[PDB]
Design a protein around this ligand. Sequence first.
Ligand code: ATP
Ligand code: ATP
Ligand code: 9V0
Ligand code: 9V0
Ligand code: K
Ligand code: K
Ligand code: K
Ligand code: K
Ligand code: MG
Ligand code: MG
Ligand code: MG
Ligand code: MG
Ligand code: MG
Ligand code: MG
Lengths: 264, 264
Amino acid sequence: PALTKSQTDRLEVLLNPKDEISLNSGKPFRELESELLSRRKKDLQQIYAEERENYLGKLEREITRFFVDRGFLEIKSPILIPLEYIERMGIDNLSKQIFRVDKNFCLRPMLAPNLANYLRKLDRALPDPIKIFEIGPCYRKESDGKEHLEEFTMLNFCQMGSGCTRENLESIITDFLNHLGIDFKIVGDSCMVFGDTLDVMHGDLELSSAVVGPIPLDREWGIDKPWIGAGFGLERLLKVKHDFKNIKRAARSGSYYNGISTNL
Amino acid sequence: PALTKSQTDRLEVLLNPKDEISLNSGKPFRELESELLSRRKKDLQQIYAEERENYLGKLEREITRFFVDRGFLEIKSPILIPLEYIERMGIDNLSKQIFRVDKNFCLRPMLAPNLANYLRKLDRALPDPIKIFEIGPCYRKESDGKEHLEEFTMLNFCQMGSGCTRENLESIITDFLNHLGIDFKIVGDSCMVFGDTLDVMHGDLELSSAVVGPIPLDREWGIDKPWIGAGFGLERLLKVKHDFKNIKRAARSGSYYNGISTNL
Ligand SMILES: Nc1ncnc2c1ncn2[C@@H]1O[C@H](COP(=O)(O)OP(=O)(O)OP(=O)(O)O)[C@@H](O)[C@H]1O
Ligand SMILES: Nc1ncnc2c1ncn2[C@@H]1O[C@H](COP(=O)(O)OP(=O)(O)OP(=O)(O)O)[C@@H](O)[C@H]1O
Ligand SMILES: [N-]=[N+]=Nc1ccccc1COC(=O)NCCCC[C@H](N)C(=O)O
Ligand SMILES: [N-]=[N+]=Nc1ccccc1COC(=O)NCCCC[C@H](N)C(=O)O
Ligand SMILES: [K+]
Ligand SMILES: [K+]
Ligand SMILES: [K+]
Ligand SMILES: [K+]
Ligand SMILES: [Mg+2]
Ligand SMILES: [Mg+2]
Ligand SMILES: [Mg+2]
Ligand SMILES: [Mg+2]
Ligand SMILES: [Mg+2]
Ligand SMILES: [Mg+2]
């Protein structure tokens, strides 16, 4: 008895990476569904009894402790930002990916512009070097893909003044991903906003783009010192850590809790 | 020499509750500004050297530990939600306060609808009672006021099944605000969405509205058991804790860091 696409889709929702079950072994859909429902209810009950922290929240807290302890100031800046920031970032009419709000606002697609403003302002009060970071929601319209979400969570850390070299940027990235237990390589790439990037890759999955300044865009943001920075997607980190097949398992969602289907 | 409105406004930006300085003593603006700039640079330098955690982030983490330890599951749900949720909540054409995104979406003005969906789904898998909470950004268009932000941070905790009484709701609120060191009273009020509320007041400042179910809206959300819940604004909690005159000192902002002006 062969499984329909709808039946396979339902079993895939209930399947977890740790399972090893053949979906098309010939066992009937009813028994495969019942087995997976039982495994997932047990998993959720164990979370509720013993491990009540959300994966995205817990990872944000772990990353926050890492950067605070290394001397970076924790920033929480607006998610709803002026639309004028988009063109000023060199996103010329990525631009199609912006969620607009009212007539003059949008949802931020990255943390960089708010962090650029903080670097400039804090440089008037704090000693060299200025080290800051932020973790929070960012928004992009995307085609359906196993590695993209329209609502995702970014970490960006950055530094301005002394110590803003490629070697120090790579060392921070290495210490960070070693702390999380994630292997990686660095490959060159390029993007419209920042130019050349050092992309942090786990296999074919891009975990981060990082940048060594200065870049021409600096003048438009009042940045006038060396700087380094890197942006990472937290859901991509979670996808690696938990071997999820689709990044949706990691997202803000009413459909998955810590990678377990909530449709039980 | 009298201070202009622009001069007083600048000094108020730089003034902090712990200061006691007369702005209109007759001392010249230049000296008052220089004194306040020096106090604020010292305050920011001390934060950077010793206390690098953001007040909103730190408070979210403190609240998260409180509720996780008391048996509530930590939720992180979408901020960008379907516009259809608004009318289904009984917000008839508050409705004017909704930030719309594209044609079918909006920024959530509260956490309740996403938490209602989680209560319903989790009740099929978890033992009675179901206890969950969320902390995160919410959005409302507001008139300019000392107690309102357009981008704010909500905590909502809620419970469904046994133990969903007024006395237990008040006891959780009392334990929570005792943990934060904030005195309060409970006053009855009423709102369009939920009906009668127990409003948690610190003086004339509304910290929370709380609700004892069931209510007629339950049927439209598939909720069919007793429930209790309460929503609190984190920036209002911070305003009380730090004696801020305006809630903007507590907000996500590029203009204040932990209540200290970033325009230094
Ligand atoms: N839509 C998305 N969903 C999930 N994570 C994302 C998304 N877009 C970017 N990220 C994460 O944010 C990081 C920094 O953003 P960046 O602008 O470099 O992404 P990107 O180069 O557009 O990524 P990609 O090429 O995969 O679309 C990325 O390396 C990735 O980890
Ligand atoms: N615009 C806002 N800015 C900051 N906090 C808010 C805002 N709106 C609501 N809150 C906080 O969220 C809690 C729950 O939201 P609720 O819908 O009860 O607010 P509300 O009754 O509209 O508040 P208010 O009467 O002060 O406008 C409030 O008690 C308050 O602490
Ligand atoms: N627009 N903008 N931001 C500007 C623009 C001009 C100058 C300086 C900043 C801000 O530089 C920072 O401190 N943040 C990190 C920058 C690189 C982020 C990483 N490549 C990412 O894509 O996640
Ligand atoms: N819409 N909606 N939510 C509905 C709608 C119907 C039924 C059940 C919920 C969700 O009930 C919850 O579990 N959350 C807390 C509810 C009260 C929140 C508090 N008064 C506040 O205003 O912050
Ligand atoms: K497997
Ligand atoms: K999404
Ligand atoms: K004072
Ligand atoms: K605001
Ligand atoms: Mg992209
Ligand atoms: Mg890329
Ligand atoms: Mg990239
Ligand atoms: Mg209101
Ligand atoms: Mg009210
Ligand atoms: Mg209220």
